[PDB]
Amino acid sequence: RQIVVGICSMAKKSKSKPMKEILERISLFKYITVVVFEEEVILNEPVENWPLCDCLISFHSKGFPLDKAVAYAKLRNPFVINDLNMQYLIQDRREVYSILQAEGILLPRYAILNRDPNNPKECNLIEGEDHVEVNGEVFQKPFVEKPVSAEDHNVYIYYPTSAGGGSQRLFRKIGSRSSVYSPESNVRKTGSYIYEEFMPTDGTDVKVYTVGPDYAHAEARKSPALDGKVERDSEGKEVRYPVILNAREKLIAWKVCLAFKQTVCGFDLLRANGQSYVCDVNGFSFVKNSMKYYDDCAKILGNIVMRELAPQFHIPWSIPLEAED
Ligand SMILES: O=P(O)(O)O[C@H]1[C@@H](OP(=O)(O)O)[C@H](OP(=O)(O)O)[C@@H](OP(=O)(O)OP(=O)(O)O)[C@H](OP(=O)(O)O)[C@H]1OP(=O)(O)O
Ligand SMILES: Nc1ncnc2c1ncn2[C@@H]1O[C@H](COP(=O)(O)OP(=O)(O)O)[C@@H](O)[C@H]1O
Ligand SMILES: [Mg+2]
Ligand SMILES: [Mg+2]
Ligand SMILES: [Mg+2]
Ligand SMILES: [Mg+2]
Ligand SMILES: [Mg+2]
């Protein structure tokens, strides 16, 4: 019989153009059949009624019942491409940063301010005009303030008096905008946050997309905080610039992929002061315009499936060479 690769995610993702481009290529593997789990099934059917698969590609996004996916994987014991239990931790910036540190991955110097919403003034924060002290640790402006929820994209940057003060408020893109300037100079009064050193880049973010630990595609885009105007192309896509990862960065990608156990894993690098710092690890993420990425990604995923499952299915398999980017 065919090796079944099941795809289990919210329809917003499963039916996205990048996903459909990748799945059509995976389907070209002679011995692989792709089955995309319907959103109505994921949300409303007990996991005992979900389709069978031999290999499961499943990932959390807003509204996804991760508990069910974990229960399904437990029930059916498929080969799992992106580890499901780690996807709970990926939702928490504190957990993400803890893992990066444990792996010796460079990241911004940071401190966690946990607030008890019941008693919010009891927290370990002292604020001055050009700095904060979080658990006694001093962050001079510019510094960055991130909601502990990785799914909350309201990231604020605070400017020093020397640069005019105020703050830049970043958010999930709305049309042509990715951030706005605010005259507000004081930090947020409610919520729990990570405070971190601002890393000066050349005005671009590097977005990295792994497919297993030995492949990573990178591309750059204008830092959302710079002025907040999104650079769009004639097709309405964000303008993305060429990047080739150096040896250090290729190692970072290998570590991130393995440490988070996410074969397909997006993360962000800040190229600053002659090094590269990880500031965000997103897990399963979508490259949006590269035909070669779709080719490479589908081929690597198919080969991973074949290498793991062909012997069990009595299918001959010789593992081929794969590009590193
Ligand atoms: O990780 P993914 O593939 O799930 O996508 C993430 C995010 O990627 P990230 O994880 O690296 O931060 C995307 O940002 P980018 O890297 O393309 O700039 C964003 O696209 P966007 O803002 O629409 O950007 P445009 O298409 O307008 O240029 C998308 O937002 P939505 O589709 O509106 O929900 C997000 O989904 P979710 O987190 O569920 O809101
Ligand atoms: N420590 C930092 N120094 C400089 N810029 C940062 C820093 N942390 C985040 N940024 C900027 O803010 C953007 C959003 O932060 P990020 O941690 O990636 O949040 P998100 O999970 O919402 O994508 C980054 O892409 C980068 O441009
Ligand atoms: Mg096929
Ligand atoms: Mg996500
Ligand atoms: Mg959007
Ligand atoms: Mg990010
Ligand atoms: Mg993120």
Curated annotation (Swiss-Prot):
A GO BP entry: inositol phosphate metabolic process
Binding site for substrate: 12-13, 172-173, 207, 221, 285-288
Top-level division of the source organism's lineage: Eukaryota
Annotated keywords: ATP-binding, Cytoplasm, Deafness, Disease variant, Hearing, Kinase, Non-syndromic deafness, Nucleotide-binding, Phosphoprotein, Transferase
Annotated GO CC locations: cytosol
Pathological association: Deafness, autosomal recessive, 100: A form of non-syndromic, sensorineural deafness characterized by prelingual hearing impairment. Sensorineural deafness results from damage to the neural receptors of the inner ear, the nerve pathways to the brain, or the area of the brain that receives sound information.
Protein name: Inositol hexakisphosphate and diphosphoinositol-pentakisphosphate kinase 2
Origin species: Homo sapiens
Lineage: Eukaryota, Metazoa, Chordata, Craniata, Vertebrata
